[model samples]
Target: SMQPPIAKPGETWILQAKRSDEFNVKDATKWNFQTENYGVWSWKNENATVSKGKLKLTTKRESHQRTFWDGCNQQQVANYPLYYTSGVAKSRATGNYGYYEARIKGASTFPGVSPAFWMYSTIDRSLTKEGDVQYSEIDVVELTQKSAVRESDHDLHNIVVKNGKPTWMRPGSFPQTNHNGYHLPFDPRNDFHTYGVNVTKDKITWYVDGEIVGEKDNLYWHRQMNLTLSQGLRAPHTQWKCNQFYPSANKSAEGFPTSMEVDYVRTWVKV
Candidate 1:
């Protein structure tokens, strides 16, 4: 068992065993291998593996046709051609109001992909009443998605019902109040670094390498969320306009297989 490296004054943190992983083995009981195709790439369980006490989520160049859910159109896309595949591991249980941390190294390739550690809650519109808040997301880190070596994104997204429809409470774009575009002093792909977030009823604080990087008001992120680590095709290679998917313009086989490796994931709640 392990506790958070840092904690608030007068706060005692207790490690949550079920939500923490050492990656000594890939425990299926603790995590779910995501199989859905999100856009430019499909998720394959084979792409996620554990060895040498690390969990590696690999992105590879592959070709296949499969039907996937289109989140934007809210329909099933029949026989969608998938030219790439990646991996995602999402915790089976949900957590709230805790300190979540991970030791990770970004994928070696860049400008086309991102390795991310985040948390999100599913939205159930049927269970949501008018003016209700149903969904929340916290992006702990999205490495090398902007600048190849120095930049990372720590963002927050939440949904609130307005006019009987679930609507984004904050625009999930750069320059927004909830988006923190940070420049690191070192390349994340070179070594493992600790990325963490402390979520409470009043505030959300983000940390990199045990130092505070950003903080924001915990307005609507009170919902429980699943912890996730994933790799995906990003901008310049893939596009999402109004939540609709677009294929990559560059399909070169260069950087055919790249991986985001995690040393461990640990979570703690205030006692």
Candidate 2:
């Protein structure tokens, strides 16, 4: 188990300020942020930068806006520094079930955008060890335009590759946020707010702001799965998407600075 909760709401919880420049590819002591270079994750020409200290991720029509990066219908993405609208962030230092979260401000973001908070066990996910992890993917929250966030029921999923095919346990509104509907309570563009996932030994609870939106039980996988933060070009970050389906607005926005911001994070473990 990790450290116990601070107890008193004020002193018990450690209020930490998360910054973008503190990102380390190896460790996850401090949370990670996404850098799209184009600024906002969904807007192609809109790019932002940091002034003073706050990470600006949105660009206005007057300041900076891109319509494409290379061509008219393609978004630019390399592998190493995957920017939002392109990158992924996962926790190596503190993996496994616990309290994980962040506060992000984003635009309406299109259906082609796939940003998520998930966990995957990194202990040899090869087919040779099929009986092992078998890619036990716990997708706490995943947003896409095809199934608009407004159409969600605070969905929580435990998708797994059992016979090399995906099978998952999804929720159906009942203890749901916004009465078991909608992907975002307030558009990410409005302001910064909290999104958290509280993990228990046998179940997981997800939240936006502080409302319990998604949850699930009857889990068996007990290995530590690293927390991942990823923003991509298409919906569902599943196979046959990303590179094949990402839109072309990315081609119009070049030489612009863009990034995701995390206000704070707190965790609690079983005693």
Candidate 3:
């Protein structure tokens, strides 16, 4: 009897079994544990686990020295000293024009990390031509990175090829027509809440706790996307200013060893 909070009048939604997860176990057929280094932290399969009917993505304070690709500088950095490790789970199958929902509890740490549920598409530079959109992202929610405890971010991104190079049409975390800064009545870290997004051919609508929070026109999100659950280091813990990526000099272990938990993730397509 599970269903999306809202649906078009007279429209029926069919649950997508391949894209949904109950979190009773770690199913390799449904998700891929990302092992790449990103931002100021590295991702390891050990950091993600399924136990007691919940999917836990943990972030830990640890020392790891390795060489990783630095996308910001477009180069590989040698002997990168990573002081933190995090978890990321990406869906194996891609989906489009559906209702995506997850019951999640944010990481206990504040201002240092963000527990996010989002979807994105990868870019193939070789197949991209001038003025062609090859990448897109839709953020359902990013919790506990903003200044206020009750605030969350719902954003969008579209990357288009310009002059044979990929260019972001709408970038950064600032206020935009495609971004929504929503204020909730409760702290997400304290309790599990449902965050969802309904993506149709013409629009994208965001929902929190089964209530609509924001909406925007579907501009460049027509392509299929992979769902992701991750905890990312942010702000004072890392240097994102000026498009840089590294641990900040003032970074500390204030909020280390935190976890983001999910009870379930479900997807439904209009039928």
Reference-based lDDT, each prediction: 0.84, 0.44, 0.84
Q: Per-residue lDDT for 1-271 in model 3, tens only?
A: 5667786577788988877899999987888887455678888999999999999999898888888667667888899888888998899888878999999999888878899999888875655777777887889888887788789988888777778888775535434656888999899998799999999989999999988888988877887899999999877777764355678775577778999999999999988
Q: Residues 1-271, candidate 2, lDDT per residue (tens digit)?
A: 2222323433333322221122313223443333234323333322323344333334222222334343234545343222233444444444555566655554354544444556655434453432333434555555543455444333443444556654433343223311223456565545666666666677667677777776666253456565555544443222232223333333333322234443433445433
lDDT of 3 at 99: 95
**Clash count, predicted structure 3:** 0
Model 3 vs. true fold: TM: 0.92
Flag clash pairs in model 3.
Answer: none
Instruction: Output the lDDT of residue 31, model 3.
Output: 89
- Residue 216 lDDT in model 2? 62
C-alpha lDDT of candidate 3 relative to the true structure:
0.84
Strongest candidate by lDDT = 3
lDDT of 2 at 90: 44
Error of 1 at 8 (Å): 4.7
**Cα RMSD (angstroms) for every candidate in the order listed:** 2.1, 8.6, 2.1
